[PDB]
Amino acid sequence: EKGKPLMLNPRTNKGMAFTLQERQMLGLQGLLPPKIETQDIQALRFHRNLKKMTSPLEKYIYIMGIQERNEKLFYRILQDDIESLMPIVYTPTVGLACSQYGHIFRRPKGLFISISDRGHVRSIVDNWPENHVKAVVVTDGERILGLGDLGVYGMGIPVGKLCLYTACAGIRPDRCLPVCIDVGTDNIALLKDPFYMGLYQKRDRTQQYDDLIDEFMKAITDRYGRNTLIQFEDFGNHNAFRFLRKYREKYCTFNDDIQGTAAVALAGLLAAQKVISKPISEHKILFLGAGEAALGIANLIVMSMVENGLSEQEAQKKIWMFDKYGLLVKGRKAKIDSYQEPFTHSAPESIPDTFEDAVNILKPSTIIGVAGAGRLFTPDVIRAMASINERPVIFALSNPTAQAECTAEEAYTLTEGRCLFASGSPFGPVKLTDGRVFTPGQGNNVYIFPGVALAVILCNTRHISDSVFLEAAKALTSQLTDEELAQGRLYPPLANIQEVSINIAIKVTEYLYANKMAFRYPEPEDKAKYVKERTWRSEYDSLLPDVYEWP
Amino acid sequence: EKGKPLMLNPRTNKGMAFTLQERQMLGLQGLLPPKIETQDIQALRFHRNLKKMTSPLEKYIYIMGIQERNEKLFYRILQDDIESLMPIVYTPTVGLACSQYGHIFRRPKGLFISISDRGHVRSIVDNWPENHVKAVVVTDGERILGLGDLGVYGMGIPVGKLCLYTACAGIRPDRCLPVCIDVGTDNIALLKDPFYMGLYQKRDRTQQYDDLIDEFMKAITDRYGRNTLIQFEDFGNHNAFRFLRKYREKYCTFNDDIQGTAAVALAGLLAAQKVISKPISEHKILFLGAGEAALGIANLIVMSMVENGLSEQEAQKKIWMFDKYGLLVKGRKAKIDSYQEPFTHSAPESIPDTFEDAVNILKPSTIIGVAGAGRLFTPDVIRAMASINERPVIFALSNPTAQAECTAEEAYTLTEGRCLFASGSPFGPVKLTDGRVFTPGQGNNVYIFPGVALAVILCNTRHISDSVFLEAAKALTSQLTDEELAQGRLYPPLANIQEVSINIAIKVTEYLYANKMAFRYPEPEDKAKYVKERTWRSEYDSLLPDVYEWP
Amino acid sequence: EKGKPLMLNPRTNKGMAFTLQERQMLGLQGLLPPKIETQDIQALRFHRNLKKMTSPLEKYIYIMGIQERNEKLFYRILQDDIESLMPIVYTPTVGLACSQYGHIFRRPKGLFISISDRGHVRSIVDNWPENHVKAVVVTDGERILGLGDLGVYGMGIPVGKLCLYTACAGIRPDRCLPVCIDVGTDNIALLKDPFYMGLYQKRDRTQQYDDLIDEFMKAITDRYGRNTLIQFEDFGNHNAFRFLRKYREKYCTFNDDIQGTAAVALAGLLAAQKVISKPISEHKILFLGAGEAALGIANLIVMSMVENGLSEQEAQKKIWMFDKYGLLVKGRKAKIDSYQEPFTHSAPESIPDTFEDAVNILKPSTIIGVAGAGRLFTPDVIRAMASINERPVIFALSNPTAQAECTAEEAYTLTEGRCLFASGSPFGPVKLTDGRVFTPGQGNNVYIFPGVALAVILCNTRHISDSVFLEAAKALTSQLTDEELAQGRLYPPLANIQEVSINIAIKVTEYLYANKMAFRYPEPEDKAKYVKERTWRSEYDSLLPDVYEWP
């Protein structure tokens, strides 16, 4: 192609950063102003403009705009302050954006397969411009973060992650593809909003539903290969948990909200013991709730507990769960799902009633907050664990900084900095009464999924096993400098999420090869330089044709 | 536009004559043989191959090939050997090819409008790739030359024709458009021809046919401009005359079969007298038939008799018509149509039975053989004219050479050479006993329409007046040379048909301006340069961008 | 893409076969005669036309055009009458066309990597409009059949060849790419040909040459992957054997004029013995030449011998070769090449001054005319062998039908039908005095390269071993009927080359597969239906967009 269609395609457009030669060769001369910018000027003007921006959503709507304008530029700036931009491009700003979706709508971004399209998903799947695709993120928006049902308003999610895929891992922007499935909704507020962008109708939980998913999986694979990466996101547990059991062994899929999480959690717990050094067998982990996040970590734990010569059975018997309906035990009045059954150990002599109550009775070495019900890690709770453990482990991942089970402060200050804390949300250093500063640890999934993703793709791996995430964990934590440890943080600084992911890549592509799960041939000798070589760069490319005089 | 499509479109492609640099900058490198030919080299490979060919229609096939192949090479070749290729790319071989259309089809060429498309003509009209179309050529296939109704097999003419408009006048191909309208055919054979490629049904003569032409008429002027020229062709006398009467002053249209013909005749008819010199007033013209081609002329004659000082009446009264049914006289039994009455004079004392009988009875000065009935211009008939006239004028235009009213020999020899003979069929010189080579001329309409077409175009004339044909006629005649006269031809050698039409273009555009029939401003001063300036080239152009250093 | 480009493309064009719906929707109405044809009427128009043809090259020309205007059709027509068209699209008419290339030239047909494009081939590769290429053919026009250095006039071989890959095996056209590499030329005549379409310089042989080959090999692989099939062709022995050993291991390359030829012969020879039954050990084999063919053939034989409980050494020791410099024995006066040594045995007591002479002293079971010098298997040479052996094997591969070492007649007759004949050129049945008719079997490589090519591709077989060709022969050979064996052919009817090749492919896949060299996963339980599926078709395909109401 040539001409303005060049300037129209974000994948090509370089704005003023187009060289005079191209500008001429390409028949652009006169379509751009007499100025030839660099990628540093263009970028400058950006911050120079993002600053004057007030609200974070406004900044989102701005940046997200340079995505459908100039692919390179958009992504260059991305890493430019990847640390600070991430929270606008993704969490939490995107939850805002996702709620606003349909109002702040401007240009479309992903792929849309509706239940009204059943029987033709393929052709649709064939409507997508991109030739080579390797990454696919899909959601049916049923559980858009803590916003619950958001229908197609949720497509904001796929869009976000795929950005990180590239931003911190180096996956090709073209090779990705966010997708949103529309089967209707349940949010009335959504069913009566003239600005909604999907089929106006209650969800579809009939057989039609699965078949549709089925049809799309095949359509995607059919169209792009069987090794093509398919990440399930924001779904309705039940489905999100069964749609995994089902296809995992059939396709190249994985669900971050589950596997992706458990990965980071572990990493946390891990690095903790690296400083605690407490003989596995004696551990006691108690959960403040039995949901998705829980069951998810609960097993990658057992999994690694077991990997240490422990029988799955005795392993999981070291895992206790406490959800709204009280403590998770045998025979209780409330209900307990199949996934729950294992972690539901026969009732202890005396039954607590307060999480705080439980803590005692059971006496866990560890305690994790995943109930998203605000601050339940009372001062008492903390201060009790703080007693029973010479160095307690507390993890409040609930989000946002509104739902955490507690705070970093109450955490350390109520334990003599004798505890090891980690927050799912962000939290500031903590200097205490003795001039002691404790920089805490935030467990974002951005720590895993992008790394695991790059590996599985560059390896032509055909399936993603749990041992992978379990291995992913290690990879991560095994990135914590002793001083980081000294500092007290159980997660590598979010400033270098790149390299960290790039490293995690390596170590995973290696692992893959060793266990012979990688089919990419022929195996390379230097995976380091291997991987590091395959990353996608924002650095512009000359569009000039290869002329050359002929002797 | 770039890539193979450059090589795929005939207008762009130029084969191995594509310069290394264009190849390189256009991305055609390694798509063409490393050799770089010139146009001549190419045009040579052609004439070399053409040589080893046998049947003309075989050639016509080959040649018409380079058309839908390399626009710029095809034509160069044409005006390269015009006098010799003319009767291949067009009559007579084209007559052959039309009857064979379907068995010799390889690729489509013009625009097809069918009554099945009635109501949507416009849309059809809108599918023609070209943007700027100035000259059109329509036909409904009813009377393809002497081959009659040929259904869609006639589309072989609009193309042939236009080749001349372009090769002779110097008109821009991408500005012409050969159109073919389908309303069934009446040819049973075709009707049963399994390769016939039109609608399988009787010719529709209902009201619909009228509306179609209309819809099309307007649909074309709409999309292209009411100043856009439309030439009617191989049509059916009855229609070709009314449509001519109708849209004449409504659009920029005319008809070759009538208008075109008429002019060329007179051309001869003046080149003759020019050597004869016989006081108009004593002139007596007689037609061997009274159809289309006769009345078409009969009036071009009048107009000029009346231009010389006669009155409409006194002029025609010097014209007589004798068709199959005998002498055309006031009250005669056979039918006389409104377009004949004028020339149907009052019965001369004696009514002749034979054309030769009439020859005496009337005592004409000029004899016109247009009945297309072969040798009816009997040696006697010759000898008679030759007697009663010390300088008889005989015109056998019937075609082909067979239907000819006679032959130059039986004319010149049977007159000692005291006859000014012209034929619508090719005849070589005739050396008699005393040893005198006379080159009888032929009156191809190819002399007219192009040059006029040429002028009417660039003059943005809105309507074609017959006065233009009469004028045109002079133009052509006045091309003659005393030597061309002394040689015996009243028509200029086909060889320089280039200049011949070009030169006519000028003189005609001039006439247009002066009578104000021209709307192209500003009116140049030196018309000669004007036109010679506006003639399409055959020589290659560049596609190479305009690159240059910015100081 | 729609409108004219869609019919401007040989791949998409369907001529009058475009449905009305495709016509209206794709904006083609009017652009095509109002007649919707069917492939059958189209193809019908072609034979009915080809008939009136005469010269064999003429037909060639006529059919090679259908190729550049409408794929599907061309081929449809092709395999329609593959037997009669094969020789026209290929040998022995192809050579007629290579010699006349440029003297016939109309439109480019493949890739062109000149030595002048050195250091840039990649880009040139990048100019090929096809995105997924899987089959490649390359040649340097140095030894194009018994014609010799033909320059870029030889491009016609890959092109043609490719046609059969398709027409015979079922390989997707857009995935095939024929290539020619201009490095100058040693044939003078061409160097003086004003039409010559290549580098008007002497054949470069310096280091630049190989380097270019390499630059290319990767260039291709770079763009189309590594597993991309690369068959060599009509090179100058020398390089053919070297580049062979070279890239053989680093690429999916192979050479038909070596590995292919072989396979056919052994398929002939395997056949013979099936009706001869003479326990290997007692086999003796001579050769009328030691150039290219000889060695190739020879070895695969050795390979099989080996296969049957033998030893490389003795094996070839059972093989002898008599070139134009006497026989290939130890210490002879002429020059023996490295590839020739393992067949240049130690001189037997008396040394043969003649083939006939060597025929006795050696008294071989099998004989093979691969000298292409003509009839050297004289009636004596025949009868002699006839005598010596009760069931003698004679194979005269030399081509055309002029270099044939003998003929089926002089074979079957001068042996009462005691021999096992097999010729390279074409020959029809032979009836004897005792009214005994025998069809002589022809051994074209067309029987092979397709089937295989097809296999390697579909199986992503990264490399092509010799154990496959030999395994190919067996498979081919195994396609013979006992009645077919009755008539006496060692080669199945060319009339069923489709299946033959397909079935050969099926057999090979399982092989490639079972031998763990097929990488395509998952390995299909049914190779039959498997291969049988992915076969390309000549049946047109709808263009209509997938439309459907939304409930």
Ligand SMILES: NC(=O)c1ccc[n+]([C@@H]2O[C@H](COP(=O)([O-])OP(=O)(O)OC[C@H]3O[C@@H](n4cnc5c(N)ncnc54)[C@H](O)[C@@H]3O)[C@@H](O)[C@H]2O)c1
């Ligand atoms: N200038 C450019 O845009 C440019 C230049 C050279 C190569 N390439 C591309 O590189 C590819 C060849 O790579 P390879 O086969 O040697 O690699 P590989 O086989 O080592 O990689 C394994 C698979 O992962 C894909 N892949 C590689 N890096 C990726 C990334 N960073 N993000 C997402 N997917 C990735 C590959 O296409 C391949 O299918 C070609 O498809 C080509 O299009 C692009």
Ligand SMILES: NC(=O)c1ccc[n+]([C@@H]2O[C@H](COP(=O)([O-])OP(=O)(O)OC[C@H]3O[C@@H](n4cnc5c(N)ncnc54)[C@H](O)[C@@H]3O)[C@@H](O)[C@H]2O)c1
């Ligand atoms: N990477 C991360 O940082 C990350 C990842 C996943 C989940 N999370 C956090 O975990 C929280 C829950 O997410 P989820 O996916 O597990 O949801 P979920 O619905 O699966 O979990 C809810 C569980 O918590 C229990 N619960 C709710 N309120 C309770 C209360 N007031 N007291 C006691 N138990 C209560 C419920 O019984 C239920 O079993 C969220 O706030 C989220 O921010 C963080």
Ligand SMILES: NC(=O)c1ccc[n+]([C@@H]2O[C@H](COP(=O)([O-])OP(=O)(O)OC[C@H]3O[C@@H](n4cnc5c(N)ncnc54)[C@H](O)[C@@H]3O)[C@@H](O)[C@H]2O)c1
């Ligand atoms: N530029 C040229 O050289 C040129 C141009 C136009 C027409 N022509 C020739 O004129 C001939 C007729 O064309 P037209 O358009 O006038 O056709 P037409 O059918 O309209 O007219 C033919 C006339 O001749 C009469 N006629 C038929 N047979 C006759 C016979 N046997 N004896 C006497 N009269 C007879 C008919 O009554 C009819 O009126 C054609 O054969 C054609 O070759 C030549």
Ligand SMILES: NC(=O)c1ccc[n+]([C@@H]2O[C@H](COP(=O)([O-])OP(=O)(O)OC[C@H]3O[C@@H](n4cnc5c(N)ncnc54)[C@H](O)[C@@H]3O)[C@@H](O)[C@H]2O)c1
């Ligand atoms: N290299 C090229 O291809 C090239 C270069 C210069 C101009 N042009 C073309 O010339 C046109 C401008 O015409 P102008 O205003 O100078 O002319 P003009 O005003 O002198 O002519 C008046 C009319 O005649 C038409 N015309 C001119 N030459 C013609 C021809 N050779 N055949 C058929 N129709 C013809 C014009 O389009 C115009 O409608 C532009 O539309 C442009 O596309 C082409």
Ligand SMILES: NC(=O)c1ccc[n+]([C@@H]2O[C@H](COP(=O)([O-])OP(=O)(O)OC[C@H]3O[C@@H](n4cnc5c(N)ncnc54)[C@H](O)[C@@H]3O)[C@@H](O)[C@H]2O)c1
């Ligand atoms: N599938 C087939 O049917 C098939 C395949 C390949 C080759 N061939 C035929 O094989 C013949 C040669 O091809 P090639 O590949 O062997 O090429 P080549 O040029 O490498 O082989 C020539 C050999 O024959 C010998 N020779 C030359 N003249 C001789 C003579 N006058 N007397 C005895 N020996 C002589 C030479 O020493 C040389 O060893 C051709 O005619 C060709 O038609 C047929």
Ligand SMILES: NC(=O)c1ccc[n+]([C@@H]2O[C@H](COP(=O)([O-])OP(=O)(O)OC[C@H]3O[C@@H](n4cnc5c(N)ncnc54)[C@H](O)[C@@H]3O)[C@@H](O)[C@H]2O)c1
């Ligand atoms: N209407 C159409 O033209 C149409 C429709 C559906 C699919 N397809 C094509 O089929 C391909 C899917 O192949 P698969 O995954 O089943 O292959 P596969 O894995 O079963 O086959 C192995 C390899 O052989 C190649 N291959 C298969 N048939 C071929 C042929 N006939 N000619 C040349 N190469 C061939 C494949 O591309 C593949 O790389 C897609 O690339 C798609 O473009 C075409």
Ligand SMILES: [Lu+3]
């Ligand atoms: Lu999520």
Ligand SMILES: [Lu+3]
């Ligand atoms: Lu006409």
Ligand SMILES: [Lu+3]
């Ligand atoms: Lu060959």
